[PDB]
């Protein structure tokens, strides 16, 4: 499939944007692999940091 | 607890009862309290453990009526007879019974006794190790014993058919200890005819373990020291010699072919180094035991032939007429003329050649070409006779420690004679399995012989 961020031309992922991040976490809250979400390597890395920042500020769960 | 279990069992014994799940039993018994439900579960488990009820693969309870491992088995087998196993066996522990074997033999299959009767006939007891008692059908050892088919006797070692703990222990007719046997007792007249016989289960206690060497020294070498040592047994050994000669004379008169070939025996030491290569001689003591095992084997085969139940035979078919024609042309070059045609030769006509070539330079080769003209003996469910022994009925009964066919013969004896199970379903079961067993064991025998020869060479 296609990268969300290269597609929609999103250069900057934001940890505050919970709704976006929630598209990339599983039911249990596990970060979905790149192979499953079609994400670019570049954006997987940015995305991963965002989710971890989000988890830290209790925007997202560690474990659902 | 017990009153509840009885009530549940009574309910399940009713004629209208069908196998029910735990929930269906709860409903049918009107159990509404959690403590009564706990009682039901405990009762079902306890009754299932006692084997009074059975749980099906669909978790329904029902009444039963209405519905390394070889070595572990060997290790669990008792080293002594259980008193319960003496039941319905003839007690022969007070009789003079002996084994006669090779000095190195530890797997003693057979024990013999001879009594001369007042009318001048002989009573011969042949008492064979009851291996079928310890190696039950479909046991781990049984499956392995089928796979092996026979013991293999290599130059330096034996590969046994059954584990050494049984073969040398509880199955072996060890000296002066109680042993279970399947016995063939035969009354034999002055012409070597079996006039009466009985096949039965017994318990024996061997008086002595003899060797072929010791028995020859007593009978042939007239050894006074050994006769004094075995003074009580010497009369029996002399009657055994006479009876064996009578049986041999009858066997030869019937026209059996005495294939007495010089075989090599390789002699090794305890380290397996070769010491010597000698001619294997068959002494009087070996030939005596041979005749007793032969008459027991014939008697068992004849008994089961007339009983007309599925059984296993040791057959030797008639020679190939073309091979035999070539043999008859061959011996004519040496000036030996045989009475008969290749398509209807009597064994006696071949024996007459062996007797005529005895102690001649051409003996070994006429003997060898005669053998090559014969067929191989094999196991078969059909009684096709045994050409080489000039007999219509022959089986192997006398060595169940080392031959799986003999172990099958013992099981068929127990099934048909002792247990009286001659029903159609029992016969069909054996009629189906005996062809495969006969083919396999005949293959395993050839494989053993080819390996033994390969080690000799």
């Amino acid at each position: 499939k296609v990268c969300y961020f290269t597609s929609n031309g999103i250069t900057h992922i934001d940890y505050k944007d919970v709704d976006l991040l929630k598209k990339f976490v599983s039911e249990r809250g596990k970060i979905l692999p790149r192979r499953v979400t079609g994400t670019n390597a570049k954006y997987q890395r940015k995305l991963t940091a965002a989710i971890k920042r989000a988890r830290q500020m209790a925007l997202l769960p560690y474990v659902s | 607890k017990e009153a509840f279990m009885e009530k549940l069992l009574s309910f399940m014994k009713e004629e209208a009862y069908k196998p029910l799940t735990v929930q269906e039993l709860e409903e049918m018994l009107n159990i509404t309290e959690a403590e009564e439900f706990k009682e039901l579960v405990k009762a079902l488990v306890a009754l299932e453990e006692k084997g009074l009820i059975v749980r099906t693969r669909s978790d329904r309870y029902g009444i039963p009526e209405k519905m390394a491992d070889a070595m572990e088995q060997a290790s669990s087998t008792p080293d002594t007879i259980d008193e319960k196993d003496l039941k319905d066996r003839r007690d022969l522990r007070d009789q003079v019974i002996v084994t006669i074997d090779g000095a190195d033999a530890k797997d003693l299959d057979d024990a013999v006794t001879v009594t001369k009767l007042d009318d001048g006939s002989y009573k011969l007891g042949v008492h064979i190790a009851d291996v079928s008692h310890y190696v039950t059908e479909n046991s781990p050892i049984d499956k392995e014993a089928l796979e092996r088919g026979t013991s293999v006797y290599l130059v330096d070692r034996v590969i046994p058919m059954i584990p050494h703990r049984l073969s040398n222990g509880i199955c072996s007719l060890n000296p002066k200890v109680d042993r279970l046997t399947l016995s063939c007792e035969m009354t034999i007249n002055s012409q070597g005819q079996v006039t009466e016989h009985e096949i039965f289960q017994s318990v024996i206690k061997t008086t002595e373990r003899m060797t072929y060497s010791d028995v020859n020294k007593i009978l042939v070498d007239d050894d006074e020291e050994l006769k004094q040592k075995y003074e009580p047994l010497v009369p029996m050994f002399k009657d055994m010699e006479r009876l064996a000669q009578i049986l041999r004379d009858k066997r030869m008169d019937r026209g059996a072919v005495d294939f007495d070939f010089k075989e090599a025996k390789v002699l090794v030491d305890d380290e397996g180094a070769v010491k010597d290569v000698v001619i294997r001689e068959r002494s009087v003591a070996e030939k005596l035991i041979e005749e007793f095992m032969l008459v027991a084997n014939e008697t068992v085969a004849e008994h089961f032939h007339w009983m007309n139940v599925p059984f296993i035979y040791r057959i030797h078919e008639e020679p190939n007429a073309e091979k035999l024609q070539k043999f008859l042309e061959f011996v004519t070059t040496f000036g030996y003329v045989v009475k008969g045609t290749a398509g209807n030769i009597h064994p006696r006509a071949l024996q007459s050649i062996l007797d005529a070539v005895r102690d001649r330079p051409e003996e070994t080769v006429i003997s060898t070409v005669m053998l090559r003209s014969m067929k191989q003996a094999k196991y078969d469910p059909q009684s096709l006779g045994h050409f080489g022994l000039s007999t219509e009925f022959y089986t192997h009964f006398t060595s169940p420690i080392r031959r799986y066919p003999d172990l099958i013969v013992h099981r068929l004896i127990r099934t048909y004679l002792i247990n009286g199970k001659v029903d159609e379903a029992t016969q069909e079961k054996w009629a189906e399995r005996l062809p495969d067993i006969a083919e396999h064991t005949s293959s395993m025998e050839r494989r053993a012989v080819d390996a033994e020869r390969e080690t000799d060479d």
Partner: protein, 89 residues
């Protein structure tokens, strides 16, 4: 040659049921044996077999005769077989 051994040798030589080919090879080979030795080919053949269960003895004799003949250097099978028989003899 009124010989079952010959007939059996033909069967061992035969490939893909082509019995004719094998018959021809054998008869030609036996001609080569007679032309060299002067002896009867059959006699030489039987001598060859001697040097190479009773049924299995012949089986192995003929099998080896043929197997090794095929491995020899001479160009045709009739010559390879002749030379292997002559050697065996």
């Amino acid at each position: 040659y009124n010989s079952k051994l010959v007939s059996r040798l033909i069967n061992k030589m035969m490939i893909d049921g082509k019995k004719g080919k094998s018959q021809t090879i054998l008869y030609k080979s036996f001609d080569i044996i007679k032309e060299r030795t002067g002896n009867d080919a059959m006699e030489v053949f039987e001598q060859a077999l001697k040097n190479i269960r009773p049924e299995r003895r012949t089986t192995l004799g003929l099998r080896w005769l043929v197997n090794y003949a095929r491995l020899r250097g001479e160009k045709t099978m009739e010559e390879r077989l002749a030379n292997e028989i002559l050697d065996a003899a």
